[PDB]
Amino acid sequence: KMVREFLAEFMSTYVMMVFGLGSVAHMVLNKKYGSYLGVNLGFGFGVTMGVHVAGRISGAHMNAAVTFANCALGRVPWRKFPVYVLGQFLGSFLAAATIYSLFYTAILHFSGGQLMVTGPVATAGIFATYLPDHMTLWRGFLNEAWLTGMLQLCLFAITDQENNPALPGTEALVIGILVVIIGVSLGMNTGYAINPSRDLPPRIFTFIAGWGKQVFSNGENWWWVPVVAPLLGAYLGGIIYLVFIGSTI
Amino acid sequence: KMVREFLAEFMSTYVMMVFGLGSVAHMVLNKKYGSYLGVNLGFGFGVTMGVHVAGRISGAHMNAAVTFANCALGRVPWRKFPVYVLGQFLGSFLAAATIYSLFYTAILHFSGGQLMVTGPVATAGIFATYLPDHMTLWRGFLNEAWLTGMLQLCLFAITDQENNPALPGTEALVIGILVVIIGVSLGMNTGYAINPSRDLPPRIFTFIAGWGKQVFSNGENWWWVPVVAPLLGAYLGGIIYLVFIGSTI
Amino acid sequence: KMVREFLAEFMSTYVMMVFGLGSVAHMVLNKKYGSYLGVNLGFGFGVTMGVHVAGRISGAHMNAAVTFANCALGRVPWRKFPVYVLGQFLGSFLAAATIYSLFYTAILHFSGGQLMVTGPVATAGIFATYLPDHMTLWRGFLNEAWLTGMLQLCLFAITDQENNPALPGTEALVIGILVVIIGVSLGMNTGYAINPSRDLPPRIFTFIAGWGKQVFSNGENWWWVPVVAPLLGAYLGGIIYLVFIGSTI
Amino acid sequence: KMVREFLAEFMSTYVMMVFGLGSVAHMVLNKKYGSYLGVNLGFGFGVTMGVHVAGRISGAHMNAAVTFANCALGRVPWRKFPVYVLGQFLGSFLAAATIYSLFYTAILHFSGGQLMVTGPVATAGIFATYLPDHMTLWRGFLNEAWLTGMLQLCLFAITDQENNPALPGTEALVIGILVVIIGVSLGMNTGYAINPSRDLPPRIFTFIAGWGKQVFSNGENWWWVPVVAPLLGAYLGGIIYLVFIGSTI
């Protein structure tokens, strides 16, 4: 049943965003002591609930890039890939809407205090990822592909039962721990936008909620690299597994 | 027998408060370096000990709402729901008393130094949850309903053995990290008062311990929303499971 | 084989102290950002390695109080109890000696800078536990018995295989998590001196390393309550298990 | 085959550096709020991903000393030890290069702002470990030998299936938390340079990247003690197991 699979992908990427976008909205509009580790450990734990909640029906894709890499390297149906990508896009667009509906007055009061009419530099940083001042567009690629490819290589190493002792239940906890490490050690280079649907659907909402063109560009065009560099990174990560380790098991 | 269930619900909600109220009492009266994540991670870990201790004989109903939603969607005995709720109330009222008996002089010295005669503004924040300055009564509902409904939806997804990775033992640990995420990403909006018995029984004690009406109102009528918003949130979260995922298993 | 059991109890309480005493020496003599959670999470993780390392031969007692409670409530040989208590006393006295041998110059330079001739108020706080200014001797009892009794009731609930799904390997990780919660929510009341041998053997060393009478008294006599209140608390915690929950499984 | 083992030791020590060097590079060039625990917890979690990824074909020898001690006490092929060590060196030299390629402009802007021409005093602290101002060369030995010997003694106790609770899958996670404890309780004494290949291959890169002699000496001759003290510590830790516990199983 497909609408069985789609429905979980809507909700499970939601849990990811509300738990991932909630913790950063808490950071900029709620004066919370959130350190780099406190946003990664909560995001990685949140993506683990997304694995736990929606494991049975989908396999917990929650990523347009791990779905495109499971088709090219994991014999997942190509008939399922478009229906999947449109569901965890819509599930993240609605995720941002509810976290802004619950923080509604935290925006108008933080912006009112700091006299931010255009928040496309700090406040929108909550919904989706944005580059640091000290790098540029082609550097985000190298950063997003090299990390999404490392996610794909553990996501295959944890689900690989022909590898070190299989983790019956601890699989989803370490997949979180993994992104915790990628967000803690490289999250400040691009925001660890591992997922094209973790970053674009919130942008199209933030576009709606009064941020405009700058939600896509982010000063210097930035919406391309969250959508294409992860898809170009998860494939590089999937091939290097089946060749460098999978051909060795 | 039933007096087994009640006795554990008394003790198991106790473990929650003393571990949860202890960690925040440490914040205002013991000059501890405690972040939002360190109080959520300690509360969620504490609720996990509450699952572990009193799971085999109770099912770990540490929530007047998780009991009311397991009765409406989990065929729990309706004869057991009132007796269940009175043990987890009395177990939390006694929980606050022991943590106030152990911190007794930390109150009288903190207030004596800061000339706090009426502490229903900061210090009672220890026992139960209180709204932030920037929102109001109808705002707690959206926050408490939308989050208790996210709790109920994992608490069902974690105990769902027809969802792919079965968690033999990691169930109670992942329920903890879940509230760690809800307290870290939305805990400053209402205090994540997910349980009507996590918030009312400590208030009736703080009422006794010299805080007065303001323990119930907290500036504005804040004792209603912990008691009614979780119950209306756990039902929405329980129906949203069996409809959006359960009809998807 | 007994010297088989003793040898592990020497070493496994060592691992506890070096990992537990190391993190606090790092706090006072090495200017490390250690928050209340960073000392509890590292101690609880350290006591978990102590369970992991020395599980097979002893059962990971590491506590003169859990050994005296396993004899009265767990049919452990009374012939083994004295040989056990003298080993994880000596194992903690040597543990403090090596952590002071590695931090040797961090004492003489911190004391040299802060002109501390007598360090029995802050510096010795690293080796063993010491009361806060705002409570007294009879209050430490209530604090140490009520917490050591909560340790004993989880340590029995995690090893109880007739309770919720047994934790094959995750047992030792949650025993740490438990003390993490007791040190995070009540560690500032007495130092969570759960173990009589975690606190006395380091004192007899600190007595040696140039701290004198004040290592035992701590301003106001303090060495009695770490040694007797845990033994009086682990028994209260062991009886309440087999009666309030064990008689219900 | 052997070229399977080498290839994974290249990649698996890479994962360690990029996750370990990334998290501390974030500290000096990215103005991140990073505590001692947040860098140890991220390094130890990263070393756990190194165990998980390359366990089935290597056994996860991510340490020139853990290989040399598994050969002397674990009947590992002596023919495999040199080829093993050259892959985990080259894999760490390339690891630093990719984390310096991703942080490239964060160096030139941090040094340009702080007028750091020679950064072998703070910034190279990113790639490899460096002594603190308050100790000297013979002090690193006691610290590096006593800790690498504690690592080797758990790494054997975790993989010891004749020790009570067998950890099917939790093995790699608990090895991580162990170094989290060693980096949190003794990491400021030497940088917990437990692996000769965690500390030398990044230096030879930092030598290349414009840091010069001072990457090897670090004020005083500090490149020797990461290479020789771990090897002398892992042997003491391996013998202390099979003698104090292994003859106790």
Side-chain angles (χ1 to χ4, degrees):
Chain A
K1 180 154 158 290
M2 179 68 68
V3 66
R4 177 170 78 147
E5 297 170 5
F6 188 97
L7 210 179
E9 292 262 319
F10 180 93
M11 75 181 65
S12 177
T13 315
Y14 208 108
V15 169
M16 265 177 43
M17 209 78 224
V18 286
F19 286 167
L21 197 168
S23 285
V24 198
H26 202 338
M27 196 56 206
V28 65
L29 308 181
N30 210 354
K31 185 39 177 85
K32 172 205 166 211
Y33 184 71
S35 189
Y36 78 135
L37 177 61
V39 315
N40 303 135
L41 192 61
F43 186 85
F45 288 175
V47 305
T48 288
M49 305 311 108
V51 167
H52 199 326
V53 62
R56 193 85 175 169
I57 58 90
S58 59
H61 288 203
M62 290 315 93
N63 197 342
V66 311
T67 308
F68 193 68
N70 200 11
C71 310
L73 190 283
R75 84 208 174 259
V76 81
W78 59 92
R79 307 175 280 182
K80 289 195 189 305
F81 171 81
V83 154
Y84 270 115
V85 77
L86 197 150
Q88 91 279 46
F89 184 112
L90 183 74
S92 299
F93 169 77
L94 199 67
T98 312
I99 187 66
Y100 171 81
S101 295
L102 300 173
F103 290 51
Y104 182 82
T105 37
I107 82 152
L108 188 139
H109 192 275
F110 186 64
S111 291
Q114 190 177 14
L115 203 56
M116 307 180 53
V117 59
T118 192
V121 170
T123 59
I126 68 193
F127 301 94
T129 72
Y130 289 128
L131 195 64
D133 41 7
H134 291 143
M135 53 179 71
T136 179
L137 181 91
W138 63 81
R139 186 157 281 153
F141 258 90
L142 189 61
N143 183 234
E144 275 298 338
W146 184 258
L147 293 181
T148 301
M150 296 165 86
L151 181 105
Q152 192 66 79
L153 179 139
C154 267
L155 194 146
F156 288 164
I158 297 158
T159 53
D160 198 341
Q161 68 288 14
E162 299 79 19
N163 197 346
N164 214 236
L167 308 179
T170 75
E171 284 182 298
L173 187 68
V174 56
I175 288 175
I177 277 188
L178 160 73
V179 86
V180 172
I181 305 159
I182 297 162
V184 85
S185 64
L186 296 99
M188 188 77 29
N189 295 295
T190 46
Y192 61 94
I194 322 297
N195 177 356
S197 169
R198 191 224 94 97
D199 189 280
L200 171 55
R203 292 168 96 83
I204 69 142
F205 169 73
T206 308
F207 198 68
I208 285 182
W211 268 273
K213 61 182 176 74
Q214 295 278 139
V215 77
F216 293 121
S217 60
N218 178 225
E220 61 291 334
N221 174 247
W222 199 238
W223 72 265
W224 185 243
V225 48
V227 81
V228 74
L231 187 137
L232 184 141
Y235 187 70
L236 197 153
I239 62 179
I240 58 172
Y241 187 67
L242 184 135
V243 61
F244 286 17
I245 281 192
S247 298
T248 72
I249 53 176
Chain B
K1 56 170 167 62
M2 177 58 226
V3 70
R4 313 201 230 105
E5 209 283 330
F6 190 93
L7 211 177
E9 295 257 313
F10 186 94
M11 80 181 68
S12 176
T13 320
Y14 210 109
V15 168
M16 261 174 39
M17 210 79 225
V18 46
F19 284 165
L21 196 165
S23 284
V24 66
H26 199 0
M27 199 58 205
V28 302
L29 309 181
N30 289 65
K31 182 47 200 91
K32 159 260 290 202
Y33 299 87
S35 181
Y36 292 60
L37 176 59
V39 64
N40 304 136
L41 194 63
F43 185 85
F45 288 177
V47 187
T48 286
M49 303 308 106
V51 165
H52 192 117
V53 60
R56 179 86 174 169
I57 63 104
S58 296
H61 293 208
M62 284 313 99
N63 192 350
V66 86
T67 308
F68 190 65
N70 196 6
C71 304
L73 185 93
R75 80 211 170 262
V76 152
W78 55 89
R79 306 173 281 183
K80 277 199 186 41
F81 171 77
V83 51
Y84 276 27
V85 73
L86 198 151
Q88 46 180 210
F89 187 114
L90 186 75
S92 299
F93 171 76
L94 201 67
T98 311
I99 188 65
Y100 173 83
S101 296
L102 297 168
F103 290 50
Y104 183 81
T105 52
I107 83 182
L108 193 139
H109 195 276
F110 185 60
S111 72
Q114 189 173 12
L115 290 172
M116 313 180 58
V117 48
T118 190
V121 311
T123 80
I126 290 327
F127 303 84
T129 72
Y130 289 136
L131 194 62
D133 43 5
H134 294 119
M135 47 175 66
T136 179
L137 177 86
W138 65 86
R139 301 292 295 271
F141 253 84
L142 292 187
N143 183 235
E144 278 299 338
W146 183 258
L147 277 294
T148 300
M150 295 162 83
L151 178 100
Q152 188 67 79
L153 180 145
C154 267
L155 195 147
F156 287 165
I158 306 330
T159 49
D160 198 338
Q161 71 290 14
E162 295 79 20
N163 197 347
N164 218 342
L167 299 188
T170 38
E171 286 186 305
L173 187 68
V174 57
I175 290 173
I177 57 189
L178 157 73
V179 85
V180 173
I181 302 162
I182 294 161
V184 84
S185 67
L186 293 101
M188 177 94 233
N189 292 120
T190 44
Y192 59 95
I194 52 183
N195 308 320
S197 174
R198 181 261 175 254
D199 185 279
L200 172 54
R203 294 167 96 85
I204 71 144
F205 174 74
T206 309
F207 195 67
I208 283 183
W211 268 269
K213 60 184 175 75
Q214 295 282 137
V215 80
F216 293 124
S217 60
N218 178 90
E220 61 294 332
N221 80 340
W222 198 239
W223 74 268
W224 183 243
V225 61
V227 85
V228 72
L231 189 137
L232 188 142
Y235 186 68
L236 198 151
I239 64 178
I240 209 76
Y241 188 71
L242 189 83
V243 176
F244 286 25
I245 318 188
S247 300
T248 280
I249 298 173
Chain C
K1 180 154 158 290
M2 179 68 68
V3 66
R4 177 170 78 147
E5 297 170 5
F6 188 97
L7 210 179
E9 292 262 319
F10 180 93
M11 75 181 65
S12 177
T13 315
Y14 208 108
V15 169
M16 265 177 43
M17 209 78 224
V18 286
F19 286 167
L21 197 168
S23 285
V24 198
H26 202 338
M27 196 56 206
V28 65
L29 308 181
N30 210 354
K31 185 39 177 85
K32 172 205 166 211
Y33 184 71
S35 189
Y36 78 135
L37 177 61
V39 315
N40 303 135
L41 192 61
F43 186 85
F45 288 175
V47 305
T48 288
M49 305 311 108
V51 167
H52 199 326
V53 62
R56 193 85 175 169
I57 58 90
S58 59
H61 288 203
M62 290 315 93
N63 197 342
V66 311
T67 308
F68 193 68
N70 200 11
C71 310
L73 190 283
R75 84 208 174 259
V76 81
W78 59 92
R79 307 175 280 182
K80 289 195 189 305
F81 171 81
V83 154
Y84 270 115
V85 77
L86 197 150
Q88 91 279 46
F89 184 112
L90 183 74
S92 299
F93 169 77
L94 199 67
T98 312
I99 187 66
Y100 171 81
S101 295
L102 300 173
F103 290 51
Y104 182 82
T105 37
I107 82 152
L108 188 139
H109 192 275
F110 186 64
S111 291
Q114 190 177 14
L115 203 56
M116 307 180 53
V117 59
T118 192
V121 170
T123 59
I126 68 193
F127 301 94
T129 72
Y130 289 128
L131 195 64
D133 41 7
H134 291 143
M135 53 179 71
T136 179
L137 181 91
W138 63 81
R139 186 157 281 153
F141 258 90
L142 189 61
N143 183 234
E144 275 298 338
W146 184 258
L147 293 181
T148 301
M150 296 165 86
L151 181 105
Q152 192 66 79
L153 179 139
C154 267
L155 194 146
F156 288 164
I158 297 158
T159 53
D160 198 341
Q161 68 288 14
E162 299 79 19
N163 197 346
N164 214 236
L167 308 179
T170 75
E171 284 182 298
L173 187 68
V174 56
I175 288 175
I177 277 188
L178 160 73
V179 86
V180 172
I181 305 159
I182 297 162
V184 85
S185 64
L186 296 99
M188 188 77 29
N189 295 295
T190 46
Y192 61 94
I194 322 297
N195 177 356
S197 169
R198 191 224 94 97
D199 189 280
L200 171 55
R203 292 168 96 83
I204 69 142
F205 169 73
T206 308
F207 198 68
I208 285 182
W211 268 273
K213 61 182 176 74
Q214 295 278 139
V215 77
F216 293 121
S217 60
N218 178 225
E220 61 291 334
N221 174 247
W222 199 238
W223 72 265
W224 185 243
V225 48
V227 81
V228 74
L231 187 137
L232 184 141
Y235 187 70
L236 197 153
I239 62 179
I240 58 172
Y241 187 67
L242 184 135
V243 61
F244 286 17
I245 281 192
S247 298
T248 72
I249 53 176
Chain D
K1 56 170 167 62
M2 177 58 226
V3 70
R4 313 201 230 105
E5 209 283 330
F6 190 93
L7 211 177
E9 295 257 313
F10 186 94
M11 80 181 68
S12 176
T13 320
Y14 210 109
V15 168
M16 261 174 39
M17 210 79 225
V18 46
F19 284 165
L21 196 165
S23 284
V24 66
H26 199 0
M27 199 58 205
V28 302
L29 309 181
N30 289 65
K31 182 47 200 91
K32 159 260 290 202
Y33 299 87
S35 181
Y36 292 60
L37 176 59
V39 64
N40 304 136
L41 194 63
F43 185 85
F45 288 177
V47 187
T48 286
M49 303 308 106
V51 165
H52 192 117
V53 60
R56 179 86 174 169
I57 63 104
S58 296
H61 293 208
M62 284 313 99
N63 192 350
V66 86
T67 308
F68 190 65
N70 196 6
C71 304
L73 185 93
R75 80 211 170 262
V76 152
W78 55 89
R79 306 173 281 183
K80 277 199 186 41
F81 171 77
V83 51
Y84 276 27
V85 73
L86 198 151
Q88 46 180 210
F89 187 114
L90 186 75
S92 299
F93 171 76
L94 201 67
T98 311
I99 188 65
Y100 173 83
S101 296
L102 297 168
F103 290 50
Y104 183 81
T105 52
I107 83 182
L108 193 139
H109 195 276
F110 185 60
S111 72
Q114 189 173 12
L115 290 172
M116 313 180 58
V117 48
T118 190
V121 311
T123 80
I126 290 327
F127 303 84
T129 72
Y130 289 136
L131 194 62
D133 43 5
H134 294 119
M135 47 175 66
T136 179
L137 177 86
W138 65 86
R139 301 292 295 271
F141 253 84
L142 292 187
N143 183 235
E144 278 299 338
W146 183 258
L147 277 294
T148 300
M150 295 162 83
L151 178 100
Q152 188 67 79
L153 180 145
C154 267
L155 195 147
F156 287 165
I158 306 330
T159 49
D160 198 338
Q161 71 290 14
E162 295 79 20
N163 197 347
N164 218 342
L167 299 188
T170 38
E171 286 186 305
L173 187 68
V174 57
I175 290 173
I177 57 189
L178 157 73
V179 85
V180 173
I181 302 162
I182 294 161
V184 84
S185 67
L186 293 101
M188 177 94 233
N189 292 120
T190 44
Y192 59 95
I194 52 183
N195 308 320
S197 174
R198 181 261 175 254
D199 185 279
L200 172 54
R203 294 167 96 85
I204 71 144
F205 174 74
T206 309
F207 195 67
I208 283 183
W211 268 269
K213 60 184 175 75
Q214 295 282 137
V215 80
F216 293 124
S217 60
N218 178 90
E220 61 294 332
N221 80 340
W222 198 239
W223 74 268
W224 183 243
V225 61
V227 85
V228 72
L231 189 137
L232 188 142
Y235 186 68
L236 198 151
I239 64 178
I240 209 76
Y241 188 71
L242 189 83
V243 176
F244 286 25
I245 318 188
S247 300
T248 280
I249 298 173

